[PDB]
Amino acid sequence: GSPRTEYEACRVRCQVAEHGVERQRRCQQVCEKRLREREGRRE
Numbered sequence: 001g002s003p004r005t006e007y008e009a010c011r012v013r014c015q016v017a018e019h020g021v022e023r024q025r026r027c028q029q030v031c032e033k034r035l036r037e038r039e040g041r042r043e
Contacts, residue, residue, distance in 0.1 A: 007035040 010031030018027065 002039040003035075006038060007031060010034070 011028070014027040014031060015024075018024070
């Protein structure tokens with residue numbers, strides 16, 4: 001339904017995965033796109 005874990009896990013993993021602003025912001029959108037795509041099975 002809405003696995004917030006998959007999201008919070010990406011923010012805590014990505015934040016440490018890289019360092020900066022270009023990848024940081026760009027990452028926030030990537031991790032989010034995956035979440036929204038997950039919570040949304042079909043509408």
